[model samples]
Structure formats: structure tokens, C-alpha cells
Target: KFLVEREQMRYPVDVYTGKAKIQVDGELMLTELGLEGDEQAVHGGPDRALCHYPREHYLYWAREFPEQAELFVAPAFGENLSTDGLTESNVYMGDIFRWGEALIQVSQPRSPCYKLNYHFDISDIAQLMQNTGKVGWLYSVIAPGKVSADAPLELVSRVSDVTVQEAAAIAWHMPFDDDQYHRLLSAAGLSKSWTRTMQKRRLSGKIEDFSRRLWGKE
Candidate 1:
């Protein structure tokens, strides 16, 4: 058995996400079909089938942002799975897992957007995630089948050395260096979208300038 979560928020312009439900039986297909009745789970494809958020991060966020402590809850960040044990530092880009009868592969670290601000009504929520490196990760369904709320998610394989934490750092924090770019590009299960962005940054020689906004460093 495995836990499945879904919610529909009206305050943030009708985003369907909040608390996770215990899914006993259903089709764990790609994207839109992965979580039935989930309106925000619309980015369907092979690269982003299931979104997993680390449960540990919630405690960190609550302490970091005491004013918005209530917002730091499981499934509050729009994740399909509020995972335990697995986190950005340990989960790699190409890591594969067997959850019940379904096969899932790590695709990419989730990139925060305006939706986060809308959800929590916090202006710098997205930036905080980037700076703190607590951003969650996405998964690609390799083989779809029955998944339960209590089923264990066992590691099937580790296909790359690029950890999700490193990937997120490369994406939002560090400057575009040739060596790092090449290393990430070679990661087996990296999302094409992330590849394209890295390529663009490398080619343009434009490193992101978020230090000021992220750390108050004038």
C-alpha cells in the first residue's frame, strides 16, 4: 500500500491540491491519469508522471518561516506523493523505484514558480525553496499498475550519480560552468526541458543573478 494525495484550492485560482488520500486501488498512469480528480496535475508526459515531495522538508520550512508555519504541511505543495526517507540529497536523477506493481524513475528536481506564491500567499516562497534547496522532485512512470497506500517504495536501481539536490543547485544557485553543465547533461534520466535550459545558459554564458534577491546581499 502507498499514500496518494489530492486537493483543489479556490483561493489560488482553482488549484486542486492539499491533503493526500490513501489510495487502495486505481490506475497509476502517466500524468493527468496518475491522480484522478487532481486538477493541478496537468503537466502530462513521460518526464513528469508523478510528483514527490519530501515530508522532512515541511518541518524545516515551518521553522524557517514561523509566520507561515501553517502552510508547511504535507501535500500543501501540490505533490502527488508525500514521500518518507527519500529526499533531494539522496534521490538521484535516474534512480528507479518499485512501488507496489508500478515502476517509477526520477526525472528532475521540481522548479518552483508563481503558483507557490499563490498557494501560500508568500512572496518569496519560491525563492526560499531555491535558496534552501528544499525543492521536491518529479518522477516518470516506467510501468503502470496498482499502487496501494501502504505499499513500500523499494529502490530498484540507481542510474546516475547526479543527486536531485545537486541538480537543483546547478539549476538555481550556482553559475553556469562548462564542467558542471556537461556532467548534468550526461545524467541518464534528466528531463529534456532541464537539458534545454542548461544548454541555453551555457551558450548564452548567462549565470543567474539571484543572490541579491535570495540572500539580501547588495
Candidate 2:
């Protein structure tokens, strides 16, 4: 099999402010919106909706709610699709998945940050995702297309050379250099948009701190 040639991709633009638009990339898909039936808020926000986790933390359905894996919600975070096929236990940094016209290239597993506890009603959500590593599926955009409800997803490429398992293993060796970080990004076979963002940031000295923290070396 051909090793995925690219890694770490995301939409060139984020379209999550008001109404969703079906543009060149894709339409965010949400299988289920996890709003407590008693809650009255019309839309989700930093405080009351689903994510309940911080902006930086990894996300996933509660273990108790695993049965509904195909559909779950993480309020506050900008996730369009709620899915089931991939879980943290299996997804890898270099792995590649295709859904609808959209492609998901895992760059790195998300890490739970303190912000989660601060933003939501559930104080323990942060610790939960972290301890379980059931962090929700994360990916860089590869081919921006269209993903709608009930779209069929195909796990076309799982880079055997590098697995999400291995990437998770190496994350502890933090503070990666630019090259190292890029290597990880490439491993995921993400969209070029994200790669360009990294390149631009690197050239402008914006990534110094991130690079230093990623591979443990400046």
C-alpha cells in the first residue's frame, strides 16, 4: 500500500459562526446534539451546550454513553460530525480516514487542558477524557468536500508505518523541534491548508514556543 503522502489537514476556513454553509470543503455533520432534555437554551455555547470541555482538551463520548458512539456531543467545541467508528483506543497520529467527500488525517491526539473545567457545568469532564484517553476523534483536513447527514465514511488508509498508537507513545517525549513536529503532521496525511499554516507560522517565529514544547527541544 502507498504510505499516505501528506499529514494533518483542516478546512482552510472555519464556518461556524452563524448558519452553516455548504462550501468547497465540507459541511460539519453532527449525528446527535447532546442537549439535556430539560435544558432550554436554543443553541450551545461555552457554558451550557455539549462540549463541556475546554477548547484545547481531547473529547469523546462518556464511557457510560458509549452505546451511542455514532452520536454524542461535546458542547462548546466546534465539531460538525458526531461519529462512532474511530475511538482514541484505535486512531493514530499518522492514520487516515475518509468520510463522504471529506478526508480526516490525524495530526496528533488532543490533550485535555485546564480550560475544560473552567468552561462547563461538569467539572470532572476534563479528568474523564484524559484518564480514559477516549479523546474524541481529531483530524487535519485533507480534501475539503461535502459531508452531510448519514454520509458513509471509509477508513481508506491506515498508515501501517505509523499508527495513532505510536504517536500517543511518543507524545510524552515532548518539546519537539520544527522538523519533528512537521514529521508528525505529515504522518497524519492532513490537508495542505494546515501545513501552510504551520509553515507560515514557523517562518514568522510564531511557532517557537509550540515547537519547543512539542518535542522537548527548541
The best candidate by lDDT is 1
Which stretches of candidate 2 lie above 4 Å from their native place? 1-78, 172-218
Superposition error at 114 for model 2 (Å): 2.1
TM-score of 2: 0.46
The 10-residue segment with the lowest total lDDT in model 2: 43-52
Which tens-of-lDDT digit does each residue in 18-93 have in candidate 1? Answer: 2333432344333323544443332336677677888889999899889989888767777877656778987788
lDDT (C-alpha) at residue 174 in model 2: 41
How many pairs in model 1 have backbone atoms within 3 A of each other, for residues 3 or more apart or on separate chains, i.e. clashes? 13
lDDT of 2 by residue, 12-109 (tens): 22222223212223445422222222122322121111221222223234345455443334334444334443455555555655656666555554
TM-score of 1: 0.78
Q: Which is the leading candidate under TM-score?
A: 1
lDDT values, one for every candidate: 0.69, 0.43
> What is the model-wide C-alpha lDDT for candidate 1?
0.69
